[PDB]
């Protein structure tokens, strides 16, 4: 009788007799353990959850495809609200089959931090895909983080205590792989180098010109018009009224219009805060609201052009060679020049920084003209970031956990 | 104000858990049930502590399917899965998750036996007792020596006493029966309900509903040029099987059935289509139906199956061991009392000098037991508790 | 790390503690209770489950203080306060934690009675049990049925056996019990101590010490010029009634054993606890003496010219001073007609008549001698089968088998 | 019906008991304490977390002791046998059965400091905080940030507030205070008895008791002609190196030279400093007094006290001495600061010295310093100590028996 089985025992006790909702997980901690492993199991869950979307989608698409031998499982916060190809089945987060996929399991596939109470065995392997070359420092490398409820010291040791548990950790190239060394507590031989499963679009399709065609009319865009795409990153300065009605975003759309409106379409991506209260009246055919648009790799292979400022986007969109521009409106209140950034924001990336969006809207008009100006930066920052990626990241995932569960089925 | 039992409760069942238990079903259940978790359209049925589909529940039961179809059903059974009911019934295997949820939600218990204490009867359930037969040795509180297995005469009855409070409704065949009951069973008259045993309905409306008699007969295989006799002992190869053959095999077939477990020893060889072996079988009062008399001892069948007006005869070959019964054996009973089988043969050899013989003293017997039974029994429970179950489903 | 079985003492003791029951001291004993608790010098004396300061152990314990001072000697009692004990031995009463403390703590157990299920007997205790005297009613296992509510035959007998699988010393009276003993006890002959009873020691060695005898008679102002009759009849339910209020006189008859002894005789009393406190002898003064409650049993017989009683395991420890006895069996026609629920043959090998009338009984009672003679012959040879065995020496032979046992568990 | 909260008692005890985790005493007291295991006449008392025999607590006993034997009083200690209690008063030992036994039953708690938010205050009984000090530097709710790990600024203000809610009574010092406790504690001033520190009573009834100095002095081995001044600086993180020093900053050494003849000087350290402090050649100048076990006796015998940044100096006040103020490390600390309640650069009893050297030379003529600052010496005594009118033990033994006499009908 073990001192450990003793704790999780009492423990589902009080769950299952005071009607907790975690009996279910209480339940899954005792009855657990290796045996339930079936090597031919595969849970994939993408963003915690939220979505089918991102590398776990084209680690799943490209298995789907080579390997339907398989039990494939996803995992969602709302499964009756997610759409999935092939013969995948869906399960609920904190249910009974939720906790029964993740012991069974022998590949967990996922892009984000997966959970903590979910135990994962000696035995099943968990690969990490991540979500993005960072340019904000995270995890480790973080300073300070006053995030309710918990200390910089115990937000580093319970990520540290994720991290841990990847057995392989996707990589985009040799400064994300640098980075990830010190900032996720990672050895390097961990660390695959291949790039990003949900950047393979990005090489393989990108003149595919039907598909482009398909992605165009399924948001319903001219089709005489250009495409830029705005995509800012979030801002707690700048949210304010309960969110009822927000200043004309700092872009000023009034203008875009004037000055763009004839051979462009703009494609605002936003956070899903500033989506639901950001009124697009009379900006119809210009402005096209593009923020819960489940896939956003799709967006960039339609755009001409990206406006960012502080994203780890800029990062996959260079995989195009295309012109990105910095709208940095905000940039003076940012540290005056930030270490921040594990990069040299100020010098080296692959387009203009703007504090003021007129001077913008007019060099965004001859697009041409900024490509040459900047096909030195461009090229540049396609080196350094954008090189690894060849488009077989879905391929080398997917055969690598083929390759896996045919030695796992002895 | 400590809840000092809710604590013993608990104890009990953390250690039921811990050590792993069986019981830890039971411990959980006795912790968690709550008044609450009664759902007024929610009916049990168990019958025999759950080894059968059959008597008084039964018919019950499949009353209230036809008449009342939208309640929800549940049948209590030992091993579920070897027995088999009609209709929107759900089974539960005993000391399962299943059965304890089934009992504690349930606003009405039915059985013809003693559920457990271990089960808790809320003041908000009502617990319905058909009970199982017309009494001829002493019951319950009126015993007067019971040196049971592992019990004392007092332990045992202080228990006993402990399940007929539990009773809110009892069912009585006979005011014998009733003024019994009410000593037997420590039970007030309100409580009781004399209106015949559910389980006979059909001794009374389908006697004669003659392609029912004909679907019975054929179901067991019996030759269709014989008379029935049902041999029904009682209690724990008396009668000479060789010798009714050799006296009866040309006239009738027996059915011999027990009350427990003898059965698998009758090596009926070579009585083949003469001793038809029927302990197994689950309606007993289809059995009477087509049986031409009975031959019995100390049962409460006698009671059940004179309804019938039929013969009966009462072989009795351990009444010199036997020195006591509710009623006057030796005198007032529809038949002849045999003690060895040789006579009994050949008085069975022609049935119907032995009716006119008897025809007083069996009508004797249906007036005083028999009289009451009208067949709306089994009706009269099933409306009692769609009734019950308005009022409980109401303001 | 956890055991089952300490898992569900612990969790029996958090019962006790939250619910302020009084076993807790008991719980807590069971938790506690090892094999390095054993002070191989500490002997605990109970003696009929703690009533009272008597019996073998009385006698086992008083030549040990006196051959022994050095050990701790710690009897138990019901009441510690109600009884005496003389000498060096600490009083401690039933289910405090002291009583557990000194069961734990003991290298040897002396008793004369059942002690409780509960009391752990380690591999490491001698546990000596000389019983209370040899059977004429059929006990233990030998016993046909017992149906004393709260448990059945079979459980009774259980309950029964697991105790005396504790008992590692069994003293026997003499070979008459031994054979008894061996299976009403279900015992290993290699137990049985015959050596005769402790208590009855004095029934030997001092059976003439003309200042004892004199000490007790004068102890229970006993007339001077008077011979002494002990009548003990054992306890019988049949006259049991009215709250045990009011009783009706003895069958025995006092007002004529008045008449015809009384100039002669002084009669004592022995009965039981309910009918004493509830027996008028008012006008019978300084003849019949109420005597059942002197501690000492033995001590009454040792001054006892003759013994009345009737189906009691007393004629046994009387029978040594082979005396004239009667038995007084007013009742005998009730007793199974022929009765096998003796071991011994009833109507036969007995040392005195036996009377159904206490008017014949009061006459032949008359001349005492009459009767030492007329049935000296059986008297002798009741002596022979039962009290051939005991030499006064009971005490002593239990006293050293527990010294020479703890000079042993002294390395 | 189901009593959940008892469920989980019940189950939290019984992990503890099968677990053999030493807290099985603490999870039986909360499963079992019931509003009846109270009796009136039962006083528990503990300072500084059960460290000491001292402080408030102390002279409020002692008091209670005098013209109440009737009661049952218990200490609470860390470790009772290191510890020695006049009279009647039981001991125990903490998160020992006994120890919860007592709190159960008291109908009175009486502390200095915190009492852990494990044990349960009734509402069934009395809890009376005469906390420990005139606060200087700003605490509790009034603080601004506490990195103090384990836990953060919201969570240990949120329990310090839970505590202080359970506060039936508590004590202040000064109208100051008041103000601050008000605010600071989440203190209803219904609640605040201004009464001044009862261990501060014999800073005004015993100032004069001459045959009281001297048992202070000849215990602690003082020469006799020598003037006595008291060294007590507040506990600075940053001074520690190498396993625990660098000569206390004060210059001892400077100090013997100017100072050896006329003057002996108590060292009032903390307990970390104090045994890793050697004083080899200061003896009959320098004595270490960092674990005498009554501060305010210490005040008694002292000409004059040196301090910085500590409550001491609100409490020294009392006897309108001269003090003077060693602040050395005032550069890190804010350099123009609002750390504090007052203002620590304008209205204090004295000089600040951020050098020992003007201190020294300033302390050979204490005539002259008593003489200068008198007036900010007075207005010191008036704002902060004119309520000390050490009646203070009294006033609170005599709430605590006019408390328990209401309960007994
Ligand atoms: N050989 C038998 C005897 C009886 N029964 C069935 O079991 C019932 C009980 O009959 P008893 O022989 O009297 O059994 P008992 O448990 O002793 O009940 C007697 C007492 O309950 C009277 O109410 C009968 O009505 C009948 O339906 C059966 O299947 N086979
Ligand atoms: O083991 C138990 O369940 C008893 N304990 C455990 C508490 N629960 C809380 C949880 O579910 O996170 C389990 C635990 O953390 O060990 C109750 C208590 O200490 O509060
Ligand atoms: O064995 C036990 O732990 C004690 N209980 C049995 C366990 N259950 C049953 C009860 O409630 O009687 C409760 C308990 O664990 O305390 C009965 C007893 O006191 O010996
Ligand atoms: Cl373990
Ligand atoms: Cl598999
Ligand atoms: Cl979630
Ligand atoms: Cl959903
Ligand atoms: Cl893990
Ligand atoms: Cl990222
Ligand atoms: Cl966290
Ligand atoms: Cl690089
Ligand atoms: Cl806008
Ligand atoms: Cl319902
Ligand atoms: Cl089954
Ligand atoms: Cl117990
Ligand atoms: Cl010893
Ligand atoms: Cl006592
Ligand atoms: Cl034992
Ligand atoms: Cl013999
Ligand atoms: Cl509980
Ligand atoms: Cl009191
Ligand atoms: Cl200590
Ligand atoms: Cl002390
Ligand atoms: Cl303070
Ligand atoms: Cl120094």
Redesign the interface.
């Given at each position: 009788?073990?001192?450990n089985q003793?704790?999780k025992?009492?423990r589902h006790?009080?769950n299952?007799?005071?009607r907790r909702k975690n009996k279910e997980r209480s339940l899954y901690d005792l009855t657990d353990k290796e045996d339930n492993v079936k090597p031919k199991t595969i849970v994939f869950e993408s963003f915690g959850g939220k979505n089918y979307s991102d590398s776990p989608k084209y680690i799943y698409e490209y298995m789907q495809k080579y390997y339907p031998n398989y039990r494939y499982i996803w995992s969602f916060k709302n499964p009756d609200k997610n759409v999935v190809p092939g013969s995948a089945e869906k399960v609920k987060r904190n249910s009974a089959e939720y906790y029964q996929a993740y012991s069974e399991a022998s590949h967990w596939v996922s892009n984000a931090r997966t959970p903590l109470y979910l135990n994962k065995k000696e035995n099943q392997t968990y690969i990490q895909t991540w979500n993005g070359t960072p340019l904000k420092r995270l995890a480790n490398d973080m300073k300070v983080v006053r995030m309710?409820?918990?200390?910089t010291?115990k937000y580093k040791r319970n990520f540290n205590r994720e991290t841990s548990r990847w057995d392989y950790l996707i990589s985009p190239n040799r400064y994300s792989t640098e980075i990830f060394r010190s900032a996720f507590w990672m050895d390097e031989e961990r660390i695959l180098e291949i790039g990003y499963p949900r950047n393979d679009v990005l090489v393989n399709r990108a003149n595919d010109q039907e598909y482009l065609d398909e992605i165009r009319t399924h948001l319903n865009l001219p089709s005489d018009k250009k495409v830029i795409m705005y995509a800012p990153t979030w801002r707690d300065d700048e949210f304010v009224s309960k969110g009822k009605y927000l200043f004309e975003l700092k872009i000023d759309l009034d203008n875009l219009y004037k000055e763009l409106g004839d051979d462009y379409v703009i494609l605002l991506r936003m956070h899903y805060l500033i989506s639901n209260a950001l009124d697009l009246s009379g900006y119809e055919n210009f402005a096209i609201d593009v923020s819960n648009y489940n896939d956003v790799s799709e967006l960039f292979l339609i755009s001409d052009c990206l406006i960012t400022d502080y994203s780890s986007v800029m990062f996959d969109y260079g995989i195009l060679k295309r012109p990105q521009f910095f709208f940095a409106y905000d940039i003076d209140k940012y540290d005056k020049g930030l270490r921040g950034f594990y990069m040299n924001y100020m010098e080296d990336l692959p387009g203009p920084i703007y504090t003021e969006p007129y001077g913008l809207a007019k060099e965004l008009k001859n697009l041409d003209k900024v490509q040459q100006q900047y096909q030195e930066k461009i090229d540049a920052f396609y080196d350094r970031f954008c090189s690894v990626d060849n488009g077989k990241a879905s391929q080398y995932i997917g055969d690598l956990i083929h390759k896996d569960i045919k030695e796992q089925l002895e």
């Open positions: 009788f073990k001192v003793f704790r025992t009492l006790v009080k299952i007799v005071l309710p409820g918990t200390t010291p």
